[PDB]
Amino acid sequence: AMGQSTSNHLWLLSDILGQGATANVFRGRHKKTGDLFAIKVFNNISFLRPVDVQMREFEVLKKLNHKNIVKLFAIEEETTTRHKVLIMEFCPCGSLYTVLEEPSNAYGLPESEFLIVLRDVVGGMNHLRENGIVHRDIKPGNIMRVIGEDGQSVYKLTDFGAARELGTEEYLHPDMYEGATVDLWSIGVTFYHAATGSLPFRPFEGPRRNKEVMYKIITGKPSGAISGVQKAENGPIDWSGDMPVSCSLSRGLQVLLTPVLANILEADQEKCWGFDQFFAETSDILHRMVIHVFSLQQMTAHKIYIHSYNTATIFHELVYKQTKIISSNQELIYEGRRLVLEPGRLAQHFPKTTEENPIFVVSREPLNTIGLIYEKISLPKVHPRYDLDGDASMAKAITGVVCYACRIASTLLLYQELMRKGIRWLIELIKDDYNETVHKKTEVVITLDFCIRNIEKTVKVYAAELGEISDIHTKLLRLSSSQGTIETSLQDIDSRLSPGGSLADAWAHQEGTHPKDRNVEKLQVLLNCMTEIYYQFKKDKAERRLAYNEEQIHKFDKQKLYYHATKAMTHFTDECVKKYEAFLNKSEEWIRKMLHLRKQLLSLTNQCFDIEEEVSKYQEYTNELQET
Amino acid sequence: AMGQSTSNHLWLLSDILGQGATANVFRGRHKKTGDLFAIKVFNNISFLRPVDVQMREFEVLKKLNHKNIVKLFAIEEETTTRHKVLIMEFCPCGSLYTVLEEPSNAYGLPESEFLIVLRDVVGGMNHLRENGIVHRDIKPGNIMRVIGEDGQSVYKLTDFGAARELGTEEYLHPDMYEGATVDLWSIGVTFYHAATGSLPFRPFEGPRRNKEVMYKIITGKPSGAISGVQKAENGPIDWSGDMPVSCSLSRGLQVLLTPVLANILEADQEKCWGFDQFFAETSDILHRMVIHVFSLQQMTAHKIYIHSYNTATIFHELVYKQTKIISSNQELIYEGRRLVLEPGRLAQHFPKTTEENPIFVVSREPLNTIGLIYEKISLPKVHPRYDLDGDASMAKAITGVVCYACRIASTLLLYQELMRKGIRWLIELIKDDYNETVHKKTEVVITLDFCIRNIEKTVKVYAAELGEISDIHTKLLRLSSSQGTIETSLQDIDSRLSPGGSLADAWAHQEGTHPKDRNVEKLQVLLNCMTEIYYQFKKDKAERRLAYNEEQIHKFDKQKLYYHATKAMTHFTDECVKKYEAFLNKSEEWIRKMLHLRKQLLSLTNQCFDIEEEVSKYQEYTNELQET
Ligand SMILES: O=C(NCC1=CC1)c1ccc2[nH]c(Nc3cc(CN4CCN(C(=O)CC(F)(F)F)CC4)ccn3)nc2c1
Ligand SMILES: O=C(NCC1=CC1)c1ccc2[nH]c(Nc3cc(CN4CCN(C(=O)CC(F)(F)F)CC4)ccn3)nc2c1
């Protein structure tokens, strides 16, 4: 139907993307080439119209080019309305706000995707700072996303510099709600929003006429608390200076992210960081590499963030901070074999590690099995009301919960599959410790056999001599007798290491769940049914009203949305969770029996060294008698 | 707009799925529940209308229920036209024909997906045979697909039994073109179509008035050839009794599939199988499990199909058929350690193996490095004609080629990453062979030291005796001297096994490509751009004509379709292929240097056994002298 146009570009008023106060962004094309661009047709531009100041201004933003900033190609004039149009690069993937709309990110972005957001935001914001222009309005809605040539997302900035001639209410600064601190505030609110999937400070009702509580929360700013939420109407505020349990981020990352957000979120410029302090600590986090470590003792996977130039001493220290294992007790296993790490080895030369192929950690000291620690979340109540707005928010909520449960279910299967490997390697690795003890026993056996034979031969060939021989003959029997006790007790350990020897890993190949069950795929099917319904309810909300036929379809599917969710949740707790807790219960059992056998094998091996020094004082005794 | 209806169901004439001769399939809903169903409204049903025969007939097909057969729920009558309507289950995923439309399957379905098709088709066709009804018209267009609760596809049959009151031209039987053999013919044409992505017998022009050549090809039926294609107009026919190189299937599967298709594709019922012979051999293939084996010698991955009750002897034989390695020369490695397999061990108890974590095979005998063998396919010419039909076929073709190149590029990266592991394990596994040779040397050293000491002591304490001692003293030096040669030559092997010792795997961590390069992700980006354009050209073909604006957009994108393809192909050959061939060239080098060191370590170890029997004839000689 009706559609605006320009000398070089044209678009339809239907194709609408963003609706701002001063302008509107449409999907447009170039009349000649046909490439897609973003058209910013300015609305209500008369009482200003500074064709002198804005001329050089937009020419300055024109040549401004960066990978983390939306490029402004040209400033043209509309054909009819003569409105000045900005031609920008079209960002096919929407904004960060669109990503947070996704239920998969209802409880926070994936850790990898979160690192992309943090890096691009800092790089773009730092590029704007070097030019002096201040933003203050940074929000996931004005942070666009594109797909780079390598497939990884790339985030860019755009809606800035409009405060010359003229923050979002949830991203406003306490003193600015009614200095460069106003910048970092919205940034921290944004970063918390990408990690948690929710806003830092939330009243019970929300941002409305009852948002009076909010201003008290923001002005409260207690200590280095990063969030504060009241769970009841006009009730107390639940404060916390740490991340929620539902956060999809790894524990190692939260330790580094918590201080950053705590120092940039407060009204006082006294303790608040500057752009240099912020850029210093943030870029420090980005430069670090990833170390994947699975602690068999606790059945917990860990991601330790270390710089590439650091040594293995700082590595053991950070591992202690997360696993609570003494640096001298941390023992590493990789690809079926143990790996010895020098205290001064750089992180650049570490082996290749992934979350599905990490470095296992075994400890001499007993440690409790913790397992995965996640937030148990149930389904919300589904009201029969036809409210399109309510059915849309209810769709995002109920689907995000199932996304989390499926995310946890995917993590539970990983822990079990990693456990089965870490055990299969350990039993074969401790078996190698048994193979070397046999070698050290044969050294004492060969030493025993020949040394005693010479002294038992010396009596057959060639009061005084008899007294010496007897004392020696007894001593040789003191050790050969204990040599027979160890010889048979090791066959008992070998009987334990043998299949069916009460230490086998057969239990682990039975109790838990396996990728053969396809429990994660089963949950993803129902989750797709719900996700399709969610994006459909968004489409019905945009229309504000539906026809009669569309009205009852919306109600039928809304009833199937509940049935899909319950069917998955039941399959999640009655199959995945229960079979995991049974695999974790029998996991403690085998740990006790393994550490017990490892303590026995230790002593029996050290006893071979205890008798190794005793046979060196006798083989060199009579055989080395002195005479002219 | 206009839309038919029924007592219990209603649908729009816009929502159309399949267009047949006797009926039309629409997307319909149930008036009460709102669940989706397939509506088969019969067109032109007057000169027949057997409400006596079809009544009991459709009631028989009603109760007919199977997992591999489209369920017929009810037979109702249209409101206005009074046409008899069939209510069937809606299959959301289309037909097998729709899957083959996808460029990813232009050269054949994935191996896993192919096994699903074969199993479901046989199960459904066997269920129809047990009821006596014959099909003859089996085609990927009448084989629907659904997604099961576990996420895996499920294929079902439908368009059968319509030959009572009344084969596709490309699926027709030679004698039926102008017995139960007419069945298996279309089945074989279907199975070849799913593996290759193309039809078995193809004239140059195609199925037209020049299809006269086709009938000569079908009636030719030379031997057990499964395909025959002329590459030039009215030219000779290129016959082949094997699968094409572009086939995505594994070599082990082709060996089993080739005889099946060859015996069911011929006009003669003399050599053609029956439904029992077909069901016997097919079900035999489905019952077998998968054994993933990566031969480091040839740098080739293999999938050996074996029944679970078979022994490791049949396993070595099949491995010999693919890798050409003698059963006694096949040596297995798994998870960093070698694994010894008893000749009678069942396949049920084999370790867990995947294509990304297989069982490596090393051989004593030298073998050439073959690498991946794939079909080099270039891009086709893009004509400037506006033909919507031509732009659609050209889109499927050019995108399928890039899908193949990206598939190969994904396989090349796997081979390299598997190679790096298989080498890192081997160097540490042969290092263990060096650790046990040190142990066997210390056994001869301890034997040497004490045995010679007793004879060098016997001369200090206690013509005839001197003659014996001297001959013994020399003999002890004959072995201790060679014991010094081996001792130092092993340190040279240890110098080779040490980092930088000319045998290190540092070259492999440099020459080839890595997942860090994200070369597969780079190709997938451009491949999505092309796939989106392809499905758009399908949409433009369905309209038969486009508006002026849609007309030039179709031409702009058609020009970008070529630029995307060339950009990927250049990045495929100039980055992925070249860096792979360089990794394969230096792969031969390290193989020669590894097998050379393995031959040295062998002899030096056997020499310790050669001197182990020499020191047993001397330590028991003088020390065991006889006297009263
Ligand atoms: O505000 C901006 N600058 C202000 C400044 C001072 C500087 C700005 C600038 C650049 C942008 N690039 C975009 N891309 C975008 C893309 C989508 C996704 N979407 C794209 C294609 N789809 C359609 O077209 C649908 C229809 F209806 F059109 F057919 C479907 C999905 C959604 C929202 N945005 N938004 C931008 C906003
Ligand atoms: O011939 C049959 N029986 C003959 C017999 C004697 C017995 C038969 C029987 C059952 C079937 N189930 C289907 N499903 C189906 C589904 C699609 C995919 N598709 C579905 C939903 N989409 C639309 O609806 C588009 C629109 F336009 F509708 F909005 C979009 C994509 C395409 C084709 N088919 N086909 C069937 C055919």
From Swiss-Prot, chains A, B:
Annotated effect of mutating K560D: Decreases phosphorylation and kinase activity
Impact noted for substituting V154L: No effect on IFNB induction
Record has Membrane as a keyword: no
An individual GO BP term: response to virus
Effect of I553A: Decreases kinase activity
Phenotype for D137N: Loss of kinase activity
EC number in record: 2.7.11.1
Location in the cell: Cytoplasm
Effect of substituting E551A: Decreases kinase activity
Start and end residues of each Protein kinase domain: 11-290
The organism's place on the tree of life at top rank: Eukaryota
A GO CC annotation given for this chain: nucleoplasm
Outcome (variant: Q552A): Reduced phosphorylation of STING1
Effect of substituting R49H: In FTDALS4; loss of kinase activity
Domain free text: Comprises A N-terminal kinase domain, a ubiquitin-like domain and a C-terminal coiled-coil region mediating homodimerization.
Family: Belongs to the protein kinase superfamily. Ser/Thr protein kinase family. I-kappa-B kinase subfamily.
Record note on quaternary structure: Homodimer. Interacts with DDX3X, TIRAP and TRAF2. Part of a ternary complex consisting of TANK, TRAF2 and TBK1. Interacts with AZI2, TANK and TBKBP1; these interactions are mutually exclusive and mediate TBK1 activation. Interacts with GSK3B; this interaction promotes TBK1 self-association and autophosphorylation. Interacts with SIKE1; SIKE1 is associated with TBK1 under physiological condition and dissociated from TBK1 upon viral infection or TLR3 stimulation. Interacts with IRF3, leading to IRF3 phosphorylation. Interacts with RIGI. Interacts with CYLD. Interacts with OPTN and TRAF3.
Primary role: Serine/threonine kinase that plays an essential role in regulating inflammatory responses to foreign agents. Following activation of toll-like receptors by viral or bacterial components, associates with TRAF3 and TANK and phosphorylates interferon regulatory factors (IRFs) IRF3 and IRF7 as well as DDX3X. This activity allows subsequent homodimerization and nuclear translocation of the IRFs leading to transcriptional activation of pro-inflammatory and antiviral genes including IFNA and IFNB.
Protein name, per record: Serine/threonine-protein kinase TBK1
Taxonomic source organism: Homo sapiens
Gene name per UniProt: TBK1
